[PDB]
Design a protein around this ligand. Structure first.
Ligand SMILES: [Mg+2]
Ligand SMILES: [Mg+2]
Ligand SMILES: [Mg+2]
Ligand SMILES: [Mg+2]
Ligand SMILES: [Mg+2]
Ligand SMILES: [Mg+2]
Ligand SMILES: [Mg+2]
Ligand SMILES: [Mg+2]
Ligand SMILES: [Mg+2]
Ligand SMILES: [Mg+2]
Ligand SMILES: [Mg+2]
Ligand SMILES: [Mg+2]
Ligand SMILES: [Mg+2]
Ligand SMILES: [Mg+2]
Ligand SMILES: [Mg+2]
Ligand SMILES: [Mg+2]
Ligand SMILES: [Mg+2]
Ligand SMILES: [Mg+2]
Ligand SMILES: [Mg+2]
Ligand SMILES: [Mg+2]
Ligand SMILES: [Mg+2]
Ligand SMILES: [Mg+2]
Ligand SMILES: [Mg+2]
Ligand SMILES: [Mg+2]
Ligand SMILES: [Mg+2]
Ligand SMILES: [Mg+2]
Ligand SMILES: [Mg+2]
Ligand SMILES: [Mg+2]
Ligand SMILES: [Mg+2]
Ligand SMILES: [Mg+2]
Ligand SMILES: [Mg+2]
Ligand SMILES: [Mg+2]
Ligand SMILES: [Mg+2]
Ligand SMILES: [Mg+2]
Ligand SMILES: [Mg+2]
Ligand SMILES: [Mg+2]
Ligand SMILES: [Mg+2]
Ligand SMILES: [Mg+2]
Ligand SMILES: [Mg+2]
Ligand SMILES: [Mg+2]
Ligand SMILES: [Mg+2]
Ligand SMILES: [Mg+2]
Ligand SMILES: [Mg+2]
Ligand SMILES: [Mg+2]
Lengths: 67, 185, 61, 144
RNA sequence: GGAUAGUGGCCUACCAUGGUUUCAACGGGUAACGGGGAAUAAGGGUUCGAUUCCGGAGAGGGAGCCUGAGAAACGGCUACCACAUCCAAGGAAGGCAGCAGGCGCGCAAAUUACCCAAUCCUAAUUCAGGGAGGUAGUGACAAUAAAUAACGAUACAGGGCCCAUUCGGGUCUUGUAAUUGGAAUGAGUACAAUGUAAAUACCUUAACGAGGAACAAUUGGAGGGCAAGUCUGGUGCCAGCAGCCGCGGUAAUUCCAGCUCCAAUAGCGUAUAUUAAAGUUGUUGCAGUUAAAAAGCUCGUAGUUGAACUUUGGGCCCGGUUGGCCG
RNA sequence: GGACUUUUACUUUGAAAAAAUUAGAGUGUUCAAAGCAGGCGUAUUGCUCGAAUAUAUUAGCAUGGAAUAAUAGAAUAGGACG
């Protein structure tokens, strides 16, 4: 079998320069959970429709439907 | 918009499809060398056409032409390295007389039978593709391998499969396992 | 030509041919092995000649 | 002699005189006039699909005598009606009126074939299967 | 002069009357974006190039314009036209020739998946973002490599360097089978680890997996062209076949079948287009008395073509290329 | 010593010429289509060959040639050299 290999003086330096997908292979960095691409992108388009704070328009929402 | 992957076909078909004299000779070459289909004959008739064409084009150029010498030799130097062109046939006028069996002779197919190892061309086939043979360290299962001159001596059964040591097959090892469980107890 | 001639007879002969099932036989080899069958047969043993070296003669002759 | 201009400077007249006599070449004329797009029952296409109007027994030309079992198909794309033959034995029963058959040429470069007068096309599939699939009973005609 | 970033009839004022054209202008057609290039392979040529690169154009049709270095932008605006969505009928809102997907069209073309790990791009910028791109899916478009079996034993023929008076068989050896014998292998399947961004598959590899009805190769043909049947049964100018020539009306070498056989073979057939074959477009290279084809005749402008002749012959110099002789 | 084609056509050499593709050199992707890779050595801190070359000339530019084929010139001398 033929492959490639890296030896970093100072593991701290290996934690700085390794592509993070290898760090999780070695248990040297946590696998980060995230929404799927499609779900993320969709929340970005949803937060586009909003200009400003959020919670301030939620007072506008709340001021109506009391009705 | 990724660079295109180039490719080319390796063979050619004959102009007249029904020729008794040509269909016999092709059958013969099939049986002598253990070939599969006319396509394998055809692929070689092709290589020969390309090499005779480049030679023809070189032989119409004046000798001592840098192109004629440079490409002339290299053509001859590759044809010798495989054992297609004889230790001296080495002029270009001779490659033009070369023919198909000269190539067909150099098949790892035909070399596995040529020295021992087989006792058939058809035994030679089933052997090669079935993983027991090696050229140096390397298992080669392609019957078209075209054994080159100085690798001829390294051809012997592979580090695996029973014929090279290292366990018998799993057909045999099953036969050893029926004699044990049954009348052994 | 007249276009309205009879369609009544379509499929006449195919319908009225007695069906015959094909007989079971051994499987012939495929690939390099069949081709070997042709070589050793067609010319090795030379079992058929009138001088014409027949491929598929009719029964008797 | 020879009757054609040989002058080194005559290329224009050689050039055009051939452009002019190319028009007696059948397959050059056709391809230039776009006969395929215009006068052809297919659009010049390899196959055309259409629906069966009625079935026509066409009697064959001499010395042969027989009834040739064709269908009349109006093409989905041009609406032009064309009469097409049905191959093999009894396949006529595989095609019924209003059946939407796939059509193909007879391979003659648009000339009629054999003893069938005027039939320039042949049936290929009925209702989306095949004739050989049906005739050989590899498939059944889809239940309507 | 005005305008433009700037040249310029780009536009305006005045003034001239020019400008293109049988060496084909102008117009009409293109099932026309141009090019790198593609198929065909004596040569000369013929045909094709929507489409991976470069250049152009457009973003339903037109025009307008805002911002900005850069747009006459369309995942910017304005308006008309054509479409077209939501509505409480007051109003609002849209441009998939981006990626997937739908409808329609048709002979004709795949998933509403995964990811920034690679390639590179952008930004205030190592980090964010990227349907650019890449991953997987579909995919007999093309292309490469090439399993479907290999080797022995018995029993007749066999040819049989023999040994022969009379199977007196020497010792082999080719094919054959209701006969046996073990060997082998991946197609699959599957721990693992490998691969990978994560997976998939490939490569590697434990445990498995080959004896016929399996792990069963197909597609076309068997009168000529053209490779292979005067075999059997059916049909009876009917059904059908047949590119072409032909075949079938009761002994069908051509149909429908069985058997056998040929050809190519994970591929083979059919239609269409195109090239070679075509010296049947002919420059190379055709033909024109009768086969297709010399204008009834002469004149003649474009075009094409156009006799000969003007420094030959002689004498020196310098240094290169290949050549047989020796290691 | 540096500079004439009267005015051309023609022909030689060269420059300027994208990659892909085509031809082709090198290279055992196990063969192959491909790809532009790789090849040594102790594999302990290394060494190293590559990634050629050929090719439209229609037109332009530079150039050597003057056969062929055109073309210009003194005739009412309004000709040449000084
Ligand atoms: Mg290449
Ligand atoms: Mg003549
Ligand atoms: Mg000529
Ligand atoms: Mg009759
Ligand atoms: Mg006839
Ligand atoms: Mg001005
Ligand atoms: Mg200006
Ligand atoms: Mg002016
Ligand atoms: Mg167009
Ligand atoms: Mg070209
Ligand atoms: Mg030719
Ligand atoms: Mg294009
Ligand atoms: Mg188009
Ligand atoms: Mg496209
Ligand atoms: Mg634009
Ligand atoms: Mg549209
Ligand atoms: Mg845009
Ligand atoms: Mg616009
Ligand atoms: Mg858009
Ligand atoms: Mg449809
Ligand atoms: Mg398709
Ligand atoms: Mg569809
Ligand atoms: Mg990235
Ligand atoms: Mg990122
Ligand atoms: Mg394939
Ligand atoms: Mg397990
Ligand atoms: Mg694979
Ligand atoms: Mg097994
Ligand atoms: Mg078996
Ligand atoms: Mg024959
Ligand atoms: Mg048939
Ligand atoms: Mg009969
Ligand atoms: Mg038959
Ligand atoms: Mg030709
Ligand atoms: Mg010539
Ligand atoms: Mg002729
Ligand atoms: Mg006459
Ligand atoms: Mg005549
Ligand atoms: Mg006249
Ligand atoms: Mg007349
Ligand atoms: Mg090469
Ligand atoms: Mg290679
Ligand atoms: Mg020139
Ligand atoms: Mg002259």
């Amino acid at each position: 079998s033929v492959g490639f290999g890296l030896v970093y003086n100072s593991v701290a330096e290996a934690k700085k320069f390794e592509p993070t997908y290898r760090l999780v292979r070695y248990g040297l960095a946590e696998k980060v959970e995230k929404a799927s691409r499609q779900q993320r992108k969709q929340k970005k388009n949803r937060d586009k429709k909003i200009f400003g704070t959020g919670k301030r328009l939620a007072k506008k929402v709340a001021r109506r439907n009391a009705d | 918009p990724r660079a295109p992957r180039t490719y080319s076909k390796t063979y050619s078909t004959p102009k007249r499809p029904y020729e008794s004299s040509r269909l016999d000779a092709e059958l013969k070459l099939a049986g002598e060398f253990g070939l599969k289909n006319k396509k394998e004959i055809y692929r070689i008739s092709f290589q020969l056409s390309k090499i005779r064409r480049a030679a023809r084009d070189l032989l119409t150029r004046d000798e001592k032409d840098p192109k004629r010498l440079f490409e002339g030799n290299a053509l001859i130097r590759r044809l010798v390295r495989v054992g297609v062109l004889s230790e001296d046939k080495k002029k270009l006028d001779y490659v033009l007389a070369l023919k198909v069996e000269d190539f067909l002779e150099r098949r790892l197919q035909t070399q596995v039978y040529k020295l021992g190892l087989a006792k058939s061309v058809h035994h030679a086939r089933v052997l090669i593709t079935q993983r027991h043979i090696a050229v140096g360290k390397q298992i080669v299962n392609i019957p078209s391998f075209m054994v080159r001159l100085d690798s001829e001596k390294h051809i012997d059964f592979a580090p695996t499969s029973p014929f090279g040591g290292a366990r018998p097959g799993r057909v045999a090892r099953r036969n050893a396992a029926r004699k044990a469980e049954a009348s052994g107890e | 030509a007249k276009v309205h001639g009879s369609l009544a007879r379509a499929g006449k002969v195919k319908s009225q041919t007695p069906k015959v099932e094909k007989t079971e036989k051994p499987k012939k080899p495929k690939g390099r092995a069949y081709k070997r069958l042709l070589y050793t047969r067609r010319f090795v043993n030379v079992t058929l000649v009138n001088g014409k070296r027949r491929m598929n003669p009719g029964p008797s002759v | 002699g020879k009757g054609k201009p040989r002058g080194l400077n005559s290329a224009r007249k050689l050039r055009v005189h051939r452009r002019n006599n190319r028009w007696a070449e059948n397959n050059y004329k056709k391809r230039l006039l776009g006969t395929a797009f215009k006068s052809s029952p297919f659009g010049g296409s390899s196959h055309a699909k259409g629906i069966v109007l009625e079935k026509l027994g066409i009697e064959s030309k001499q010395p042969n005598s027989a009834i040739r079992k064709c269908v009349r198909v109006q093409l989905i794309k041009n609406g032009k009606k064309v009469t097409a033959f049905v191959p093999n034995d009894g396949c006529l029963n595989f095609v019924d009126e209003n059946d939407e058959v796939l059509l193909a040429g007879f391979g003659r470069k648009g000339k009629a074939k054999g003893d069938i007068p005027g039939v320039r096309f042949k049936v290929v599939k009925v209702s989306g299967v095949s004739l050989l699939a049906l005739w050989k009973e590899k498939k059944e005609k889809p239940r309507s």
